[PDB]
Symmetry: none
Subunit: 46 residues, 35 copies
């Protein structure tokens, strides 16, 4: 006896991709703050 | 004299398979909660 | 004098076999309750 | 004088055999009740 | 002299068959109680 | 005068043996009910 | 002599089928609780 | 000689039908307990 | 000399038929007790 | 010669009806126990 | 012969209604626990 | 001939009323357990 | 010649009525045991 | 001729009263078991 | 005939009061758990 | 004629007192389980 | 002519009293079994 | 005439004492089951 | 026949009120946690 | 012989619908907690 | 057969309103934190 | 019947006071953080 | 008849005191977490 | 007559002590969970 | 023998879809918090 | 006359010792469940 | 004239002793069943 | 004149011994039934 | 005169040993149920 | 005399083996519930 | 007389070892949850 | 006697592997949150 | 009578040690989270 | 009756000391962050 | 008795290593933020 978490092991990875996937998009929006913030300073400083 | 639980011994195993079998499917649904929950956190955190 | 329960002694055994025999079948049905009951719990627990 | 119950003494035994003989057969039928009764209980109990 | 219980010996067996015969039918009805009772439990337990 | 129940005294014992003898066999069948009944409970309980 | 529980042996199986049969349906209802319960958690967790 | 339990054999079956018949109705009431009990749990669990 | 119990021998059988005959009817009534008693248990057990 | 148990044969049936008749009423009372008992459980279980 | 459980068959249903009837009321009380419990969480969560 | 269980038939019903009558009161006490038990849970849950 | 058991034939019936008569009353008392016994069980079971 | 069971008929009823009478008292003691048992459960359940 | 469960009917109520009575006290102790538990949370949360 | 169950009527009550008496003590022990169980929960919950 | 069973008629009653008398005492002992048996159950049940 | 069951009346009571006497001891053993059973639950519950 | 759960139906509602009633008070205490918690945050945040 | 759980099989489904039915409504209330909770965070976060 | 959760279905909605209702008030208090927090920053920033 | 949660209703309030009471003290300590934090900033800013 | 839960009523209160008693001590330990946690923040914030 | 449960009354108390006794020890182990759990939180929180 | 959880296996998947389905919608609402929060920062930072 | 249950009285006690004796050992095994169960919780909680 | 049953009166008592004597021994064996039966229950219950 | 039943008086006693003698042996066989019967019960009960 | 149940007295004891003897073995099998049952719970609980 | 339960003693053991034997298999199925349950928690917790 | 539960006493211990034995293994699996859970937190926290 | 949990001991380990196995995968997904979160901060901070 | 939980009292303590023992090790692992978390902050803050 | 949580009351304090004790050490590490952070600012500011 | 958490004690440490191990790697990534952040300032400041 045991418990066949055969497909359910690899199933974990199914969601994982999603975990790596969502980040890119948020992090892509995050990037504006790094631009705009330096722009925000740019126009005072430069 | 005795009592011939000959086939009834191995009969126990007949159901057992079922016992190991059902788990995989529930545990396969359980896995969503581990994905979605980390997704639920992902979108706040990441 | 005495009373010749010669064959009637061994006759007892004739029925006996029947006594051991019926049990297996009932006990074979009993076994469902041990499966189904754990299945009944399986689907809540697992 | 006396009364010659010479053969009539041993004659008693002639019938006797019959007395021991009939019993076996009835007692052989009696035995069903000991089987069936335990069978009658068997199917409720076992 | 004696007493010719010649046919009356084997006569005992005539009824006997009847003795074995009736049992099967009652015991066949008995069997419902073993089914229904486990069914009675089945629907609570399973 | 008296009545010579000399052999007929010990004759009583002839049948007696039979009385002790039959019991063992029935009691040997009785024993199934003690097994099967605990088996009947075993499969629900254990 | 004996006791002809010939058909009554196989008769046991007649009810048995019923014993295996009822379970599926209850266990099919049981399954909602495994869905709904994870749904009940899903909507808080996910 | 014998004893004509000719019709009385099949007579056993007359009652039997009744034996199978009553069960359905009780078992039909039993079924509420399997519904209501899961409903009883449903409203806490789901 | 002798005593002509010629017809009176076979006469015994005349009554006998009656002896086998009455039984069927009583035994046919007896059968209710085997039905009703199991019905009496049926409605508690099943 | 014989013995005219002509009407007394069918007489057996006169009482029989009574034998089938009384049962219905008791068995009709028995039925409460099957209701009330499940009601007794109903109010704890449901 | 047989046993007239004619009305006693349908009698089973008489109690049944009661079996379906009581449930609604308990289950109607059960429902508070599903409200109050979510209210109990509502006031912490929302 | 027969046996006049004329009034004794309907007599069965005399007791019956009692059979239906007692239940209400016990079942009325049973109901506390369904209240108190949900109250017992109420004060933890709600 | 013969023997005039003319009135003595029908006389048998005179007592008979008594035979059918007494039964009703005893059987009417018997009925309490069928009520009280089910009442005896009622108060534990229901 | 006949047999004057005139007073002895109604005599049956003399005892009967006693038959109905004793029951009340036992059944009155029975009732404790229905209270105490629910009390026995009350203190665990409520 | 019948069975005088006259006082034994109302007797049921005698115990009942007890059934309603015990609950208040347990439920009064239950209430601490609803206070202390919220106190247990109070000191972390507030 | 009758049967003088004069003192034996009231005798029933003699035992009854005992029936009410024993309960208090058991029910007094039962009460620990209601304390300790809530204590058992108290120390986790509070 | 006749036969003067004048005093012997009423003599019957002399013994009768005894017949009613002995019962009370046995029935008074019987009553323990109704107490003790319910006590025997009391200590398990209550 | 009559029958002098003078001492034999009171003799009934001689045995009676024994009837009340044995009970105490069994009932004293019964009491363990009420302790141990609550102990059996105590160690799981408390 | 049936079982008169006439008042016992509406009896369910008697307890129900209690079920709705207790909640308000607990939920009224719950509300502090929603105030104090926001107060707990208020004094850091505002 | 067997046991006609013909309608009682499909009867299981009768309750089932109820099992799927109740969930929707609770789960529909559950959904508030997913809104309000994100609203609860919304007003701090956004 | 089935289980009449007719009103108990719509009953779910009764509580629901409450579920939507409480939120508004808490969320109305939540809003202070969004004002005060920006006020808390306002007085440093502006 | 019902369940007298008469004092146990108002009992809820007993704990409540405690619920309002503890908060003041914690919230009184919370206040330091609002002082010290602005002091922590004061000494850099002012 | 009734059941003398006279002392067993007030007995409930015996344990209760214990129920109120244990809380103070745990809640007294709980208080550290409210100090230390604000201390934990104090040293970062102040 | 009666039944001398004289010592068996006080016997109940013999076990009782045991009932109060075992609890202390379990409850003494329970206490670790209240320490360790707050320690488990202590090291994250403080 | 075994237990035909044939359709009930695949039945698990029926609910599963629902499990994957609900998430998308919540996670779609979650996304606002990732926008608004960065907007909340955007207007201070940019 | 009487019945010398002289030694048979004290004989009751012979078995009793056994009754007290077996319990200790089972109750000693019971104790593991109280340890292991708290250990089972210990490793999650602590 | 009369009949000198002088010694034969007291002779009755000679056998009597035997009547009281045999009982003790059987009743001494009976006692095992009261031990073993409670032992039989002991090992399941305790 | 008279009739010299001198030796014939004491002769009566010659047979008597035989009368006391035979009993022991039968009664010795009787005893098996008291053993076996309790054994017959032993194996079901114990 | 009397009846020499001299050896037949002690004969009672011959069977007795058997009565004490059989119990040990059954009770030895009983013990599995006390192990397995706690094992049955062990694997869920521990 | 005695009763030769010579083989029937050791016969008890024949069934016993069966008693120890069946357990292993059920307990082997039980084990899934200990795995799956921790798996059921694993996927939420880990 | 008594009942030789000599080996059956120590027999209890045979199973006990098993009771202590199984725990270690489950508790050894339990330990993962204490690792993984802190790992689950580790990767967010550390 | 004992209970052969020979393979069932090592069986525990069968599931265990699964317990260690699932964690790696979840913990592997957990790791994104530790990356993305520091990335989420990276793009503001760096 | 009583129940010798003499060693079983102190037995409780046997497990207890284990209860205090396991905690240290978990709490020793807990401590990393208090280090690493402050390290996690250290490297941003310091 | 009551429950002797005599030592278990003061036992609470045993752990408490530990609760006050651990804090000092963590809070002693916390202090670095208050130094280093001001040092971190010191080297830019001063 | 006790519970052999012999290896399971040291087992705790098995995971621990993992607990110390993961930190280094995260903390190694944390370090970038301390570099980059000072670099982020470096290029404005220096």
């Amino acid at each position: 006896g045991v418990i066949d978490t055969s497909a359910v092991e690899s199933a974990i990875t199914d969601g994982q991709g999603d975990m790596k996937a969502i980040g890119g998009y948020i992090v892509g929006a995050l990037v504006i703050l790094a631009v705009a913030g330096l722009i925000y300073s740019m126009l005072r400083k430069a």
